Ligand binder design. Structure first.
Ligand code: RNF
Lengths: 327, 826, 248
């Protein structure tokens, strides 16, 4: 049946080529020989055999067979290398996680400078991204690695969230200790920079706000190399962590250790004055320092900016594919 | 890691801006001409220009303006670079010693902002109270020009109008006032605001907004006798001042877009206007004085003067002599006469300044069997299109072959003693239903001619409607004699067929040498071409014969000969064709993992593929199997402009951001994943747009030249005419030259106090990285021009390593020898 | 889409183990021993109750597809616990599971791990994953015992006694093939039902429908008493066979 994963062979796919270096293996583009469908294959190597099958991949399998949303990436099956099978011990072939192929990734589209986002385009992008995050958050999962590289876009204008390798379940009642260095510094929440080991789903909201601003500037908002420098850059724009705006900031491991140069005022509305009013309010609420005062995903979907966006009009982003060749 | 060296063989030749003023002395009339990264200072004489000084800046010159604040005897110069380095400069001369003073400087970049569509705009107040900068959508930056602002500190005023087309400071206003055309969903409008340094905000401007032409392009601030502003569009010119409103819409200007303006008469009575078909107009302001004693603008008139080069900038100088600064063709001095000549023209050319123009392609060929090498370039555009033959002999000798249409690709075919050149010319839909060319050109003045009769796409049934007056491109293959550069033949391709790629080669067991062209069927409706041809021609006995055609489902962006097979890239696909004994192309194998395979290069059985957004890929032919294999890909996202193979392991690429990079196979080889990773080992901000990489050199390499430390030779052509050279170094030589750069940067004084390390840092809107693996040869070659005290300072404590001596002290005369050798590679 | 992980009791007469000549009593014994091994090993390592149960469910499912004569049970158990730890985010290093398994197993039993215990376990992970068809997410009776008990209102102490007694019945049912016969929701109800009979409690009084005598129908739709009674019978059988008695 369709459900007996792990037995079908990778012979069933014509490999087209390598599209990226993953975490637990390389990622290939391939075409199904039977249906002609295009797929992405994440290769999982258990030959490391220090901890066997990678937990990163286990998370992605465990979670993505539960999550069904148009804005969440779909795992179609798990297939295997041709096994000599003289003995199960001799077998060292790898496993492949079969996903739907997506035309582009957001980082590629922005880094190549080949995309222009209108307001109406940003609405479609953000409505889908927040709706998918809402589905995950309402199902009590945290992504914990939201970056432009992990938001995939096909030319239909459909957005899908993708790298669930760092995803874990969140218990609101019983707080659990997690890993504090979870998101890439550019998209990391301020709470985790100050060492919050018991973090909330608000970490993902922060990342998406960073993307919201970036789509309006085409440059990442907070680009730094070290955790302190980011806190300064965030503080310069969002305001310095003070107990006035973040009453429990005093309870964070590195609050006294890590301080911005000054006590900064919030200038988000000034430095982002070129953003539409409806969007600026979304950014100010999403990039709120205190995770407990930071808006939820649902609250973003019930905003003047995204509430009345209709996803029937997907409004794909503008990609030049001719006259880009010659100026 | 990899070590490479990059030098300039020909400096940028395109004029990017020109101003006139009193910069060198309060007495002389100066002409300041800006080429990319280069500033040229001239003094106006009765015969022409007297050059006085040229400086380089560590930045692309984006804004250039002269101002004279109260208290200064002479004009000061403001320059802003494309990386947002701002400075105020002064000319100072002590007898024979000429130097440029940096009076104020700083970087005005904002942490947050969206770069505007119409680019950086910089303007200065008529009272020189402030400098206005339009860098980002929705923001206006003010650098107030107070004596104390030596760091050029500035503040931003929120600007409600996000999409600004153009802005100028107006004359005759009680406060500093800006006039700007902007675009919102309701069309384009002209609006005015007053700028308050005291309040650091806008106040309501003097005259109300008016709705203007949908394609309103340029704003002119008219001098105080009239006051107000003139707005130039595609069809109309309008003057707005207070309640006064005029509009002239003469049919002559609708024919070609007007791109430049300049004031002839300081009272504002007369202006020059230029258009993209090269026409030069006079815009006349007709005065009417009232009995009150006030003078009002009565009417506007436009008069055609003649023809110049397609000009980016105009400057009137004086005595009827105008400077035509070109980016697409040669620049000029032209004289405007009061009386027309017998042809009806008031314009007569005086001098012609060479511009290698846009270099769309080029090849190196030893025409005279002199073992030297000559560079034949596809240069210029539209009526300025030309071939340029460049040889060394101390200056470069450049011959110009006018084509009067756009050259696209060039390739040399020795067997036929001629060149093949792809070209396109503009025709316009005319009342016959066909099209008519605006002027004769190479593809119409060929000795013999032919037209494709291919039936491949003739089925059609796809409607493409035509409106009178619309432009079309008509593409041709030109056969051009290598000694006379006469156009021997011209082959016109199908209607709406673009010629994109050209090779000259033998295939298979076929002894004939063919010209092969790859094309694309371009319809306005299509996002990406879905039809195309590979055409095999034979040039024989003065006629071009069509040997074979292969239909493809896309655009043949790039082709290259591959061990007797034809390697072609069709959209995402990279294909290898064999040439059968039946003289037809047969597909052997394909590689599909691309977004758009724009560029191809080969070495042996290895192929380097340049993609629109996915950087460069190393593909390989496996002859035992008859297919392709992916050796390694650069996973850093980059928008490629050109690529080249340096050696079996190092690969050179050019970015659309004016950056260079070198990739190398990791070659660790522990795991397959590392091998499939091309590591970016070289990063370098060139500052030019590279269209073509080409292996070769123009230096006389006949037996007897002393061995150079540099190994290899890649020449490259750019949009601004700049020609450069990339070569490799040994680890020892790099470290020496790199250590010497760091010493030279401490010693050499930069114009605008721009840090050299900043200038060459890899730069996109999203990233900035320090340069690596690249020696700025132009810096190294400046050691020979610095004063002796500075030379010994540079060589102090300089220890050579990894050589005959592990530690070797360096003297200045030793480096004078090394740098002089490094100047002999070009 | 998703696989079916439930069989009918009658089907257990045809496991690979049975068809290789193992009798029903022996396979049942092997299942108890393997499960209790998993339980004991993970408890020594401090593992959450869900992690123990997940391993046990993997283990029970595994021997619906393979024979106990070809896959030594304690190796399989150790492998299942190792994977369960990664699935449930309570990871343990394989060397630590082996160390604990050696502490708890005698010399004969630890013979199953062969000359290289860690290798025998790590190698099996591939077969385990393919066997359980990469369906890693598992629900257990515990979460439903609590979800349903929370909706009971009445004597705090009588309900807590019901929960603890039922919880013990859940732990005990992991030694049986009930995990393979009935969804966890049904197990949770069955154990509540059993505890109610044993403690002489009438659970309907604690529900929002106190005159709805089939109190479980508002928690689990379509469950006949036939099922709950069958489950109760199977749980108490473990107590009667052993020397142990009902907790009460
Ligand atoms: C977090 C997942 C990362 C992000 O990059 N990878 C990723 N990207 C995709 N497409 C975008 C794309 C990238 C490169 C190319 C490309 C094309 C030609 C040459 C080289 C690269 C094409 C598409 C994917 N669709 C499906 N999945 C599954 C495996 C999650 C993808 N994973």
């Amino acid at each position: 049946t369709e459900s007996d994963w792990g037995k079908r062979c990778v012979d069933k796919f014509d490999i087209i080529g390598i599209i990226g270096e993953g975490t637990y293996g390389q990622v290939y583009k391939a075409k199904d020989k039977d249906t002609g469908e295009l797929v992405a294959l994440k290769k999982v190597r258990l030959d490391n055999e220090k901890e066997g099958f990678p937990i990163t991949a286990i998370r992605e399998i465990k979670i993505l067979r539960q999550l069904i949303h148009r804005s969440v990436v779909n795992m179609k099956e798990i297939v295997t290398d041709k096994q000599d099978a003289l003995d199960f011990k001799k077998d060292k072939g790898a496993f492949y996680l079969v996903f739907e192929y997506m035309d582009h990734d957001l980082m590629g589209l922005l880094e190549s400078g080949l995309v222009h986002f209108s307001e109406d385009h940003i609405k479609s992008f953000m409505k889908q991204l927040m709706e998918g995050l809402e589905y995950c958050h309402k199902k009590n999962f945290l992504h914990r690695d939201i970056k432009c590289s992990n938001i995939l876009l096909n030319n239909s204008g459909q957005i899908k969230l993708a790298d669930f390798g760092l995803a874990r379940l969140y218990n609101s009642e019983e707080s659990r200790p997690y890993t504090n260095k979870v998101i890439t510094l550019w998209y990391r929440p301020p709470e985790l920079l100050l060492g919050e080991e018991r973090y909330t789903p608000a970490i993902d909201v922060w990342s998406c706000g960073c993307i919201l601003g970036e789509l309006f500037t085409k440059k990442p908002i907070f680009q730094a190399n070290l955790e302190l420098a980011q806190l300064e850059l965030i503080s310069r724009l969002c305001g310095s962590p003070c107990p006035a705006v973040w009453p429990d900031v005093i309870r964070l491991p590195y609050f006294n250790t890590m301080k911005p140069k000054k006590q900064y005022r919030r200038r988000l509305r000034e430095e982002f004055s070129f953003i539409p009013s409806a969007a600026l309010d979304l950014l100010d609420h999403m990039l709120t320092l205190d995770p407990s005062k930071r808006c939820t995903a649902e609250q973003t979907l019930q905003s003047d900016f995204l509430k009345d966006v209709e996803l029937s009009k997907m409004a794909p982003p503008d990609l030049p594919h001719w006259q880009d060749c010659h100026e | 890691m990899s070590y490479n060296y990059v030098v300039t063989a020909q400096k940028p030749t395109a004029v990017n801006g020109c101003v006139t003023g009193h910069f060198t002395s309060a007495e002389d009339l100066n002409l300041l001409i800006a080429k990319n990264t280069r500033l040229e200072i001239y003094v106006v004489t009765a015969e022409g220009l007297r050059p006085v000084k040229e400086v380089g800046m560590y930045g692309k010159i984006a804004v250039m303006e002269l101002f004279r604040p109260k208290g200064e005897s002479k004009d000061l110069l403001f320059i802003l670079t494309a990386k947002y380095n701002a400075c105020i400069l002064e000319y100072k001369q002590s007898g024979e010693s000429i130097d440029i003073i940096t009076r104020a400087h700083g970087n005005v970049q904002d942490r947050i902002g969206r770069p505007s569509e119409t680019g950086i705009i910089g303007i200065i107040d008529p009272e020189c109270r402030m400098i206005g900068l339009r860098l980002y959508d929705g923001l206006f930056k003010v650098i107030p020009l107070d004596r104390d602002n030596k760091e050029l500190k500035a503040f931003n005023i929120r600007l409600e109008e996000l999409h600004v087309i153009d802005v100028k400071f107006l004359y005759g206003c009680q406060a500093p006032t800006i006039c700007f055309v902007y675009q919102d969903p309701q069309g384009r409008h002209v609006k005015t605001y007053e700028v308050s340094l005291r309040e650091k905000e806008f106040n309501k401007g003097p005259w109300k907004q008016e709705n203007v032409e949908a394609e309103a392009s340029m704003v002119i601030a008219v001098p105080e006798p009239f006051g107000g502003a003139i707005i130039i569009g595609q069809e109309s010119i309008t003057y707005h001042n207070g309640d006064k409103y005029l509009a002239i819409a003469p049919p002559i200007i609708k024919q070609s877009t007007i791109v430049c303006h300049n004031r002839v008469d300081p009272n504002g009575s007369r202006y020059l206007l230029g258009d993209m078909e090269g026409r030069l107009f006079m815009l006349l302001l007709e005065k009417e004085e009232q009995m009150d004693g006030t003078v009002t603008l009565k009417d506007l008139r436009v008069e055609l003067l003649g023809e110049t080069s397609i000009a980016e900038c105009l400057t009137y100088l004086d005595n009827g002599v105008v400077f035509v600064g070109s980016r697409l063709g040669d620049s000029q001095l032209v004289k405007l006469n009061v009386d027309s000549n017998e042809q009806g023209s008031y314009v007569v050319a005086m001098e012609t300044f060479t511009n290698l123009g846009p270099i769309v392609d080029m090849c190196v060929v030893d025409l005279e069997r002199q073992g030297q090498g000559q560079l034949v370039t596809c240069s210029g555009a539209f009526k300025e299109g030309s071939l340029r033959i460049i040889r060394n002999g101390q200056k470069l000798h450049i011959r110009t072959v006018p084509l009067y249409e756009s050259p696209r690709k060039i390739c040399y075919q020795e067997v036929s003693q001629c060149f093949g050149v792809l070209s396109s010319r503009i025709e316009v839909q005319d009342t016959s239903g066909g099209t008519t060319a605006l002027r004769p050109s190479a593809s119409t003045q060929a000795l013999s001619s032919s037209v494709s009769s291919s039936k491949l796409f003739s089925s059609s049934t796809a409607p493409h409607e035509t409106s009178f007056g619309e432009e079309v491109e008509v593409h041709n293959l030109l056969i051009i004699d290598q000694h006379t550069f006469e156009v021997l033949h011209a082959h016109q391709f199908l209607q709406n067929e673009y010629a994109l790629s050209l090779v000259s080669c033998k295939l298979g067991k076929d002894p004939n040498t063919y010209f092969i062209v790859g094309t694309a069927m371009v319809y306005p409706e299509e996002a990406e071409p879905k039809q195309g041809r590979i055409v095999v021609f034979q040039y024989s006995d003065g006629k071009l014969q069509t040997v074979a055609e292969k239909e493809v489902k896309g655009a043949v962006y790039s082709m290259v000969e591959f061990n007797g097979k034809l390697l072609a890239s069709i959209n995402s696909t990279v294909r290898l064709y064999e040439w059968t004994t039946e003289k037809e192309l047969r597909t052997e194998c394909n590689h599909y993992n691309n977004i758009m395979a724009l560029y191809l290069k080969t070495k042996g059985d290895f192929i380097l593929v340049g993609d629109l957004m996915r950087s460069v890929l190393l593909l390989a032919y496996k002859p035992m199997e008859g297919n392709f294999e992916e050796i390694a890909r650069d996973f850093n996202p980059n928008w490629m402009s050109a690529v080249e193979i340096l050696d079996d392991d190092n690969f050179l690429g050019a970015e659309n951001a004016f950056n260079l990079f070198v990739c190398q196979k990791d070659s660790a080889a522990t795991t397959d994943e590392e091998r499939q990773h091309l590591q970016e080992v070289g990063l370098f901000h060139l500052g030019e747009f590279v269209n073509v990489f080409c292996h070769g050199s123009l230096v006389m390499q006949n037996l007897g030249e002393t061995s150079t430390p540099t190994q290899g030779s890649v020449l490259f052509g750019t949009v601004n005419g700049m020609i450069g050279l990339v070569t490799s170094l040994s680890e020892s030589w790099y470290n020496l030259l790199l250590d010497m750069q760091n010493r030279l940067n401490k010693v050499i004084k930069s114009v605008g106090k721009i840090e050299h390390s900043f200038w060459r840092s890899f730069h996109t809107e999203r990233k900035t990285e320090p340069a690596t693996g690249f020696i700025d040869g132009d810096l190294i070659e400046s050691f020979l021009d610095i004063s002796r005290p500075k030379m010994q300072e540079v060589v102090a404590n300089l220890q050579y390593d990894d050589g005959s001596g592990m530690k070797r002290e360096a003297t200045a005369d030793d480096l004078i020898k090394v740098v002089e050798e490094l100047t002999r590679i070009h | 889409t998703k696989p079916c992980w439930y069989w009918d009791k009658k089907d257990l007469a045809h496991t690979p183990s049975q068809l290789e000549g193992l009798d029903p009593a022996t396979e049942a014994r092997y299942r108890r021993e393997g499960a209790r091994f998993i339980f004991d090993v993970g408890t020594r390592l401090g593992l959450h109750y869900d992690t123990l149960a997940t391993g046990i469910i993997y283990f029970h499912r595994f021997y619906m597809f393979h024979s106990f004569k070809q896959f030594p049970r304690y190796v399989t158990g150790a492998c299942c616990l190792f994977l369960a730890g990664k699935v449930e985010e309570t990871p343990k290093k394989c060397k630590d599971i082996i160390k604990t398994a050696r502490s708890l197993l005698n010399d004969v039993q630890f013979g199953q791990f062969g000359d290289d215990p860690k290798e025998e376990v790590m190698v099996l992970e591939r077969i385990l994953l393919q066997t359980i068809k990469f369906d890693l997410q598992v629900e257990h009776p515990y979460q439903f015992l609590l979800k349903y008990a929370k909706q009971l209102k009445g004597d705090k102490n009588k309900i807590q006694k019901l929960v603890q007694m039922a919880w013990t019945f859940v732990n005990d049912s992991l030694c049986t093939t009930l995990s393979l016969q009935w969804e966890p929701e049904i197990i949770a109800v069955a154990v509540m039902y059993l505890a109610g009979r044993l403690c002489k409690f009438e659970i309907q009084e604690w529900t929002s429908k106190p005159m709805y005598r089939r109190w479980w129908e508002q928690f689990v739709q379509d469950v006949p008493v036939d099922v709950l009674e069958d489950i109760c019978h199977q749980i108490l059988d473990l107590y009667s066979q052993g020397k142990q008695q009902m907790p009460h």
